[PDB]
């Protein structure tokens, strides 16, 4: 859209102003039901050829069902919390006597339903598969005949298509040990997810956002095994809610900033330690330092608020003017001077120091820019690759407008050698 950033030379940092928050600040459970019947002994005589196939399929199905039965830089500042908390609570609710029977009875003929539980929670129940009807109307009458004589090769083949799911679901639940992330398409098909989205009690904007980005809401969801009593496989999906929608917010990148002293090892320098995302939620700001948790998709970010900071709203003031008596503006100081570079949304920041070649080149005319000293900026639509020392970075090539403001080397304000070389967590 209008992705723009303003590189401030005061402290080497890129602020990619202009995005949309779409934060995730809510959990919504949903119960997905696979119905299945309990077969007795096979009661089929004669090996034949197709009878062997049916026997293998039924044996593997029973093995799957019995296996599933036998189943039942600011990172330190973040708090911790349980992610599977709503799913386990709903499962513990389902363990109560006379509860899954409500799920089965109420969901008799429709596919989707809304029911009540012991504690009064209204969750969405959805039948995903209908193995009961197929196994009690199309296979057992054929197999239970005396002198089993399967005359239809289709019998087995379509059976495969109606067994695969109940097989491979179990497969995943045997590998991930109960909970799976992300929810695979076997656990929830795309059309199934789309149908389930438009039944949640949420506003129209939330439905539009979460229906148009099914891949991301698939990546951020959880799954958990529940009771299997009364021959009804039930598992809880944890499709995330989306409280705040369409509030402008930004991403901040930092880089080292050191003096070019001739004497090696005597160039003290500080770097801002705030890399990550800042999103304007309510009258405060929500801060995500973990850049790996935040997901990006076409100007819209999707980030879990469970790992965040409730930072005060007066944080853009520190971003604009570093030296203000209104925010401590956390930093970290060291005497290590090693060439490095970062790749922001619309350009490349270079912080190479000392005897180390620095270059920026493109595939058209080759070498275009050479960096002398200090951290510098190259816009994305001027260059294609950047290189520091002996390593090569590919700058992002997505359209946008970038403006490179002029600043001053703030570390020259400080005395040549009074700084400590000890802190990973300090402030101005």
């Amino acid at each position, epitope marked *: 859209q209008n992705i723009t950033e303003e590189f401030y030379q005061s402290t080497c940092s890129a602020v990619s102003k202009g995005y949309l928050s779409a934060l995730r600040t809510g959990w919504y459970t949903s119960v997905i039901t696979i119905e299945l*019947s*309990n*077969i*007795k002994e096979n009661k089929c005589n004669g090996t034949d050829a197709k009878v062997k196939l049916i026997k293998q399929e039924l044996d593997k199905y029973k093995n799957a069902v019995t296996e599933l039965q036998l189943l039942m830089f600011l990172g330190f500042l973040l708090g911790v919390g349980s992610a599977i908390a709503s799913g386990v609570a709903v499962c513990k609710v389902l363990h109560l006597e006379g509860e899954v*029977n409500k799920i*089965k*009875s109420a969901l*008799l003929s429709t596919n989707k339903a809304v029911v009540s539980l012991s504690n009064g929670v209204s969750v969405l129940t959805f039948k995903v598969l209908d193995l*009961k009807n197929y*196994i*009690d*109307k199309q296979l*057992l*009458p054929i197999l*239970n*005949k*005396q002198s089993c004589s399967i005359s239809n090769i289709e019998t087995v083949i379509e059976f495969q298509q109606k067994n695969n799911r109940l097989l491979e679901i179990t497969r995943e639940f045997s590998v991930n040990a109960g909970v799976t992330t992300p929810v695979s398409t076997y656990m929830l098909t795309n059309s199934e997810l789309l149908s389930l989205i438009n039944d949640m009690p949420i506003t129209n904007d939330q439905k539009k956002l979460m229906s148009n980005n099914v891949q991301i809401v698939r990546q951020q969801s959880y799954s958990i095994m529940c009771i299997i009593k*009364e*021959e009804v496989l039930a598992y809880v999906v944890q499709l995330p809610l989306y409280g705040v929608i369409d509030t402008p917010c930004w991403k901040l990148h930092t880089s080292p900033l050191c003096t070019t002293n001739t004497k090696e090892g005597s160039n003290i320098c500080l770097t801002r330690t705030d890399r990550g995302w800042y999103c304007d939620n309510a009258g405060s700001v929500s801060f995500f330092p973990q850049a790996e948790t935040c997901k990006v998709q076409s100007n819209r970010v999707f980030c879990d608020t469970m790992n965040s900071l409730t930072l005060p709203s007066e944080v853009n003031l520190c971003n604009v003017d570093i030296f203000n008596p209104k925010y401590d503006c956390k930093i970290m100081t060291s005497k290590t001077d090693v060439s490095s570079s970062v790749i922001t949304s619309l350009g490349a920041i270079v912080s190479c120091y000392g005897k180390t070649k620095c270059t920026a080149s493109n595939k058209n005319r080759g070498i275009i820019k050479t960096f002398s000293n200090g951290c510098d900026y190259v816009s994305n639509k001027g260059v294609d690759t950047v290189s520091v020392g002996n390593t090569l970075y590919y700058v992002n090539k997505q359209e946008g407008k970038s403006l490179y403001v002029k600043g001053e080397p703030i570390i020259n304000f400080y005395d040549p050698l009074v700084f400590p070389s000890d802190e990973f967590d300090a402030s101005i």
Partner: antibody
Amino acid sequence: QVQLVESGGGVVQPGTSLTLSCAASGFTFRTYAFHWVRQAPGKGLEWLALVTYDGTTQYYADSVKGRLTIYRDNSKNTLFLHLNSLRRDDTAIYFCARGGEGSFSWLGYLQYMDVWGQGTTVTVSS
Amino acid sequence: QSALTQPASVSGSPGQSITLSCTGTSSDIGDYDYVSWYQKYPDTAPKLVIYDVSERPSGVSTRFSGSKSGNTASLTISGLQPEDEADYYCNSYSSTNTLKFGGGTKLTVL
């Protein structure tokens, strides 16, 4: 001591949907399954309906499907019948039946007759 | 109403044998091996005497014998008794998810 006790019946005018009730005692009820048969004077037995554990799955007869509903309430250990649009040919005695061994829905495992009941007589007249 | 054909009545002297039968089709009685024979005295509830062609319940005398052949189920007795005057019914599973009863036969002794 396995025994079934019946309730309801009598003379019913054409139409006049009548709810019929069975009962059981002396054995586990939520495990075994039940079904319902009827017999008319001068004729034989005629399959009427079948219910497995809970209201999970219900099987109906070809000549009766649609006109009849059968369900169960395990809290009161009772079995209920609702038939509407009663015709002139429903004059008969209704019998409860107990069948099945485990938690199964396939009707092939559900044809056993371990016990029977006493039946209720229902007749229509004008 | 579809049913299963059975003889109207059979009569035999005490201490003899009978060959009662009921005929169906390829998808009922003749298959699925679920043939059942039920007793009925007048004014009394029916009882299960034979199930799954030849298997027998508890408390039944060994005089009965059930079998199936082609599309016909057959019941045979030995040593007829005066209390055998009753009604016989054959019940078996039909392919279209139903349990089909017979027409009823009357057994009398002379």
